[PDB]
Design a protein around this ligand. Structure first.
Ligand SMILES: [Mg+2]
Ligand SMILES: [Mg+2]
Ligand SMILES: [Mg+2]
Ligand SMILES: [Mg+2]
Ligand SMILES: [Mg+2]
Ligand SMILES: [Mg+2]
Lengths: 339, 339
């Protein structure tokens, strides 16, 4: 896009401000050096889809007369705050899941000499958000709105992550917990709210669009798009092409409440339920092959393609009905890239 | 005191509001049940010194005409927010230090079926603070002041905890890192700011006392009292009577940048430095006996008693000079209980 350029470049000033700006407090140098390393390792390396969304939406939503360099700089900073929310979640999630890599890189907590100290580094990444907001936006009228937005997004992501941990406890294989309401509930709180609501809502407040109806309306579209994003992600984990996706999938081995397995449990005969009690969550490849096979027997990819078409119409209907007074392009830009 | 009563009782409504109040969202019941268990296990069981300080100071600072039931209830809620900040730090710190117990109880993360999931429970306890503030204080004029106070206290505690992790890395025995400036720096950020500034400053904002000079002045007294509190705590860890303290100390075994060992390193001859390189951080009891012995050879407890008297005069001088326009009783209440 026309913006990715400026977005990554501005990370350097984000880092300058967060480290240079306690330079008149030398006794904390050594911890501020470490915060620089946490930031650099964890905030950089993604695609920045969520950060950039804030910027794109800011550009589509704020009257061009009010888009000076200072404004823009604030929008780039809020974008980065979304990225940092992200980095915080991911560093913590990787520790909890005992992950090895992320973005095909070694997980921060696995780096020699980091280990569980990453719990504190993860907290710091979260703290940094509110530092940047204060530094860049304290005089703006949407300041407190943004602060509350970021805290509510965290709470919701956390409540979502609880549901996820209660549903899929590693070692307590119980496919009984994997219902569709549960599934949709986890996605909503854990993924959709911060991934699809947070960034558009942030741009909105920056634009002065702060009414509860406007936000209720954007939220309806965006949680629905988040649910599709994640279902598509579950589907693609197994049936995607790794070269295209950049991802080699392991949902089955990791015991996930994937959409695929919810669907499968709704469509299994008892023999199949047991075939799935037998192979769900084994590293061994033939056990994994066996589950995939079961998924294909029951035409789950045809189910997915059907779901993908229905949901596309549904989102477009939602847009026609709830976008206004926002430009529909704000939503459709995102629909086009996810679909 | 005349208040402890009401403070613990009000925890029940804190819990009601944080769990009943998403009762019209059933799909998240099971996670809200878990949040209730996190709250109950981790927020209860301390002495509540920091929570109660908010309440005591609110009572000493707000004109009695403005202390209705609603006001008081808000002060009890902010007290609890300080307790929850606490609980958040402690649950996370125990995971990072691999602690077994706290408050002679099993650490939350060690409870069967919790483990590293406690990272998310700890984050939730933090989120709860901002939920309570919104629920109880959003219409008050000090709302945003409090929010910023709690976020800055966290950032500072975290930066402090970084310094601590960089200074005393478990397995990288290097007494070289344990200087006095370092020591004082860790205490300040890691302990004093949230333990002694946060609660008085919170009561201040609730009282309308929001000027930067007033807060700079309270901070001077309170960081100084925090430094004494912690030095006294380091001293008592080893030389305190466990029956009186309720604590059996293990700073030496756990490789701490204790005040005792900073002092010792300033007063060691090279033979002694090596005796301390030999015994600092061993579980084995005679190695511990050996370090204590070395501390007594160099009259560290006489050093401590001297420090305790000097610092007492110093705090009183600080109070005479920086309390106004607050009632000195706000500070002296706290001086009396710590000294
Ligand atoms: Mg994960
Ligand atoms: Mg996870
Ligand atoms: Mg996936
Ligand atoms: Mg500890
Ligand atoms: Mg610690
Ligand atoms: Mg101690």
């Amino acid at each position: 896009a026309q913006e990715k350029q400026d977005f990554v470049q501005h990370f350097s000033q984000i880092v300058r401000v967060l480290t240079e700006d306690e330079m008149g407090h030398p006794e904390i140098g050594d911890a501020i050096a470490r915060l620089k390393e946490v930031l650099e390792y964890n905030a950089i390396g993604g695609k920045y889809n969520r950060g950039l969304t804030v910027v794109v939406a800011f550009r589509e939503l704020v009257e061009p007369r009010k888009q000076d360099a200072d404004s823009l700089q604030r929008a780039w900073t809020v974008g980065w705050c979304v990225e940092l929310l992200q980095a915080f979640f991911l560093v913590a999630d990787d520790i909890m899941d005992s992950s090895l890599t992320r973005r095909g890189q070694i997980c921060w907590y696995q780096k020699p000499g980091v280990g569980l100290d990453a719990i504190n580094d993860a907290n710091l990444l979260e703290a940094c958000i509110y530092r940047l907001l204060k530094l860049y936006c304290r005089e703006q009228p949407y300041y407190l709105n943004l602060i509350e937005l970021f805290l509510q997004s965290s709470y919701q992501t956390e409540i979502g992550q609880t549901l996820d941990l209660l549903t899929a406890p590693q070692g307590n294989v119980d496919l009984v917990r994997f219902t569709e309401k549960r599934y949709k509930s986890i996605v909503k709180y854990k993924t959709a709210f911060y991934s699809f609501y947070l960034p558009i809502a942030a741009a909105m407040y920056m634009a002065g669009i702060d009414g509860e109806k406007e936000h209720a309306n954007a939220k309806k579209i965006l949680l629905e798009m988040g649910e599709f994003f994640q279902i598509q992600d579950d589907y693609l984990d197994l049936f995607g092409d790794p070269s295209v996706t950049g991802k080699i999938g392991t949902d089955i081995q990791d015991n996930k409440c994937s959409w695929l397995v919810v669907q499968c449990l709704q469509r299994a005969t008892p023999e199949q339920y047991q075939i799935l009690k037998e192979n769900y969550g084994q590293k061994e490849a033939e056990k994994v092959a066996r589950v995939k096979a079961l998924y294909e027997e029951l035409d789950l990819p045809a189910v997915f393609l059907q779901y993908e078409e229905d949901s596309y119409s549904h989102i477009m209907a939602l847009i026609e009905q709830y976008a206004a007074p926002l430009p529909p392009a704000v939503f459709l830009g995102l629909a086009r890239k996810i679909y």
